[PDB]
Amino acid sequence: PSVYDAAAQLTADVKKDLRDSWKVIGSDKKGNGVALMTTLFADNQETIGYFKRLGDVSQGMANDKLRGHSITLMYALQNFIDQLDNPDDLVCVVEKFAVNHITRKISAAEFGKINGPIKKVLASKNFGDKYANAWAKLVAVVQAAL
Amino acid sequence: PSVYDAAAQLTADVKKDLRDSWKVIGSDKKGNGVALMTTLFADNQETIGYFKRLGDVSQGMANDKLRGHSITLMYALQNFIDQLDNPDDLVCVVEKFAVNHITRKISAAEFGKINGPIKKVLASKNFGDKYANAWAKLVAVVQAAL
Ligand code: HEM
Ligand code: HEM
Ligand SMILES: [Xe]
Ligand SMILES: [Xe]
Ligand SMILES: [Xe]
Ligand SMILES: [Xe]
Ligand SMILES: [Xe]
Ligand SMILES: [Xe]
């Protein structure tokens, strides 16, 4: 299937759940972005080496490169959320970020490692399994490009 | 380097002018982002070669990679606007994007070529030299990091 095919999973209900949870998670991009990355590295230690540009990714907010990365990642998510109703626009921004990951040899399966950290960050604001599942559908749009 | 000294130029008055103009420009990220890029390419044709990944940029909005790029650029600007309160956070996201441009061999002087396009896009929405000059101070923070 194509990336457009994958975006068919973003039904009205999935988009509502994405938007509702993002209103909260995206309101603290620094805090929740660094939490997302820290959780990735806590649970998926095999990924740490890919991030060597950032320095020591265990230093949390006392690592300016990690903070800058993490905030910017949250604006990638903001971008996706704002494009949900126009699959043409969603696909072209997904393809852009997919290239950022392809050129670093991140496979679709490796990209999907982010679902565990997303589930945990969601649950930190009491967004449960329905919301984690909705976010996995959005992650899968990127996986379709990888 | 002199990056923190550039960031210190974003006074309360400058920040207000950035926020007030961004309220309008950032309300159409697709349209104004592509306009910024097509204006850069038209007026600074010697920069087009750097963008070869995007294909034929003369196609404008109809070029999916250019559209994806352009939307994403506007979320870099959104990020900067949202960090204006906190010099450490503004600088760490500026440094992130500066690294992206250093990889592409973009100097402070060539990055500064965006000011003419910014002035033109602002003016098209009835934001004149006052606002162009505020945006130039923000551009100068990135220039200081290159
Ligand atoms: C929600 C999921 C994710 C989003 C939206 C995302 C977004 C981003 C963004 C915006 C960048 C910056 C690209 C650049 O400027 O070149 C980035 C860099 C990167 N991403 Fe992700 N990413 C995600 C998940 C992952 C996962 C799960 C991995 C690996 C297992 C990964 C590995 C990388 C690497 C290695 C970099 C480069 C870091 C650096 O050296 O600057 N990403 N990602
Ligand atoms: C307001 C000013 C600008 C902002 C906020 C900005 C932002 C961005 C962003 C967010 C990206 C994607 C980075 C990545 O994923 O690696 C990018 C890419 C790029 N930028 Fe800029 N940029 C600006 C001006 C310029 C100018 C003036 C030049 C050149 C003279 C330039 C040259 C490039 C190049 C060559 C790329 C890579 C395109 C590609 O192959 O994907 N940028 N820029
Ligand atoms: Xe991504
Ligand atoms: Xe999220
Ligand atoms: Xe995602
Ligand atoms: Xe930038
Ligand atoms: Xe702008
Ligand atoms: Xe900028």
Swiss-Prot record, chains A, B:
Q: A GO CC term?
A: cytoplasm
Instruction: Cite the binding residues for heme b.
Output: 101
Concerning SUPFAM superfamilies, the annotation shows:
Globin-like
Q: Which GO terms describe its molecular function?
A: heme binding; identical protein binding; metal ion binding; oxygen binding; oxygen carrier activity
Question: Which PROSITE patterns does the protein's record reference?
Answer: GLOBIN
Where do the Globin domain residues begin and end? 9-146
What are the protein's UniProt keywords?
Cytoplasm, Heme, Iron, Metal-binding, Oxygen transport, Transport
One matching Pfam family is Globin
User: Where, subcellularly, is it found?
Assistant: Cytoplasm
Family in the record = Belongs to the globin family.
The subunit field of the Swiss-Prot or TrEMBL record says: Homodimer.
Looking up PANTHER family in the UniProt record yields: BLR2807 PROTEIN, GEO09476P1
Name by which UniProt lists this protein = Globin-1
